[model samples]
Target: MDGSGEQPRGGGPTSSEQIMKTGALLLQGFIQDRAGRMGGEAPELALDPVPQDASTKKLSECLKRIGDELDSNMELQRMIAAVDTDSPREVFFRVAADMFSDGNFNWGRVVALFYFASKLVLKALCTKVPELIRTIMGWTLDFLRERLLGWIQDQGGWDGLLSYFGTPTWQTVTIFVAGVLTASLTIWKKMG
Candidate 1:
């Protein structure tokens, strides 16, 4: 096995099913780590963003939202910089502990949590993919890392991230709804 722990040459081709199971197990570990904070919530709304108070002036709320968007972007940039060939499990455990155990709960925390989750999942999935560096740069694989990272950096990525664990439930359904709509639109436009 290479440093990635993926099968090296001279072995029979591994099944995609096996790879998928590995990914699922990793995700399960993440979910278990934060189950306490989620307060027995359901997974159906897993993609929702953390809730905000309802009584603010619309302008103030919008300003706050913009600030969060910038903050998550900055966090994402820092996270990418922090990548140092660390093990996925090590990274995940460290990140999860900080997010869930740090006592302070806020919008920034939630977004950071999601970003970390997205990166962890990407690391797990990358292990299963063809290791040919050329292949890695081609097609959807090229975008996969960036897309997942972008989502992590995005302001609202935290809602879905933490919900996967057991910490905070997303208060806003709009983010997920917009995502679905945009995806649909992209597919339709591409085909048309």
Candidate 2:
């Protein structure tokens, strides 16, 4: 055999690789769609700007409805608990497809629900099969680092990474870790 390590038996990407690629593509498309709609503007829903107009009031109202729907949707809860590396896209579409339809579907809420559902799945995994959490996070981080290093070096090299960590982006990462820890703790308490 050549140095490529046994060509996956199908002469194409392995099934898991295909699944991962498709999931990544779907996720990328979702984010890109939102970015295009927003057109360089940050989400206006963040704290500390008391609404004084109709648009913000409407936006807040829509978000509350979506939050209520997410809370009451037990099916979504069950589906979120069922996600794994094998069927991430399926789970996402199932939970989010309805939210994208007509009649007041906020893309921001849809994205938030999708993310919360995913985090819930990860939390479930951490509680149910703790060993897999380490393996999954390690592989995911390695994959991200490899792609990021390659893409950025063609643009910014190591200086970009240093600049990134020196800025508020580092705090975002800390917040991400904090969110994960909070989820883990919530799951732990619930299981108790």
Candidate 3:
């Protein structure tokens, strides 16, 4: 009953579920990719990654915290509503690039970086553009792969991340990513 040799969409929960899965998969992949570097230690932190377990649980909690704050951000909501268009993913790319351009990198920034991607993907969904999710997610991973993964690996990858995230004050690593976007739109409007 198919007209062409193309794929069909599968049914799922709301876009939030899909977005959460997308983000979870992205981090899982990073951890797995870096698992090779950890030698013989608890590679299951990256390899097996059972749900409700430490690795996956911490990741979901991290995404949820940033996402709730981002959802509450009416200024960002207005910006996305105003500028939602075919090519707005460049704004995301610019912000992601700017985040690491200053030769500074840390685990909080890593968490911020991924959640910033989640923010962009969530907004792009508002555009109602089919495949915008795919486009932006792909671009985000490409940027991460080429530019940031090495440094993350150098910083001991999963171990570095776990230690940073394990600290008592991770709740404070909120939205400098959003603040950067606010700053970007401030300058972006002038350039427009």
Candidate 4:
């Protein structure tokens, strides 16, 4: 019930917030890859704001949807062509990195697309937590959450970590594409 929309406990962005966001993204992306979405709609996070509370469920759904798509082999060609190069990983990663630096509207969609691809393809390698500090009063609530997740993982997060692995080949391709698109966004913000 405060200005940051977080409540009366915070003031500014903190390290924990950044860490949680990263973990959620990574977790969601991993689930999507396992579910068969290759890219798993990873870019959707960028398309719009992904609420902290809803990240878990929504990300799970994204993975399920992408998984279904992967089984059908419907968008393979288009996915691959976008990131085609000597090395699929390098191509997509660079493209995404560049896109991130560009700051274009389409960059969001491209990142989503590329992430989906990468996720799909990788579905074919493999693959966190959080809680408490519920009463923390600072700009560091986010950081606190991340620390909580780290603690959870340290205790037994392996299950979450291992949740992604060995999807069909088609799924792997999709993941690859998604990675490229997401990386593009990174590039735009950093390298480009």
Per-candidate TM-score against the hidden true structure? 0.27, 0.24, 0.59, 0.34
Model 2 score (lDDT): 0.39
Candidate 4 local distance difference test against the native: 0.41
In model 1, the worst 10-residue window by lDDT is: 132-141
For candidate 2, give the lDDT of residue 31: 30
Tens-digit lDDT string for candidate 3 (52-115): 4465566656556566667687888787566544555666666556655676774445665665
Predicted candidate 1 versus true structure: per-residue lDDT over 23-139, tens digit per residue: 233333333332324544644224333332342233234323433454355533453554544454454444344443545333444334443444444444466542322231232
* Count of backbone clashes, every candidate in sequence: 4, 0, 0, 61
Residue-wise C-alpha lDDT for candidate 2, range 44-147, written one tens digit per residue: 22222233445334434433433444545465455444444455444344434434334542223323543454353355354676454344434433433443
Top model by lDDT, which number? 3
What are the lDDT scores of the predictions, listed in order? 0.37, 0.39, 0.55, 0.41
Residue pairs that clash (backbone atoms under 3 angstroms), model 1: 34-166, 37-167, 38-166, 38-167
State the number of backbone clashes in model 1.
4
**Each prediction's Cα RMSD?**
19.5, 18.7, 15.1, 15.2
Model with the higher lDDT, candidate 1 or 4: 4
Per-residue CA lDDT of model 4 for 2-88, tens digit only, reads: 555554225453343554655545444544345453344554233433324454555455445655565455444454444433453
Candidate ranking under lDDT, highest first, comes to: 3, 4, 2, 1
Q: Of models 2 and 4, which has the larger lDDT? A: 4
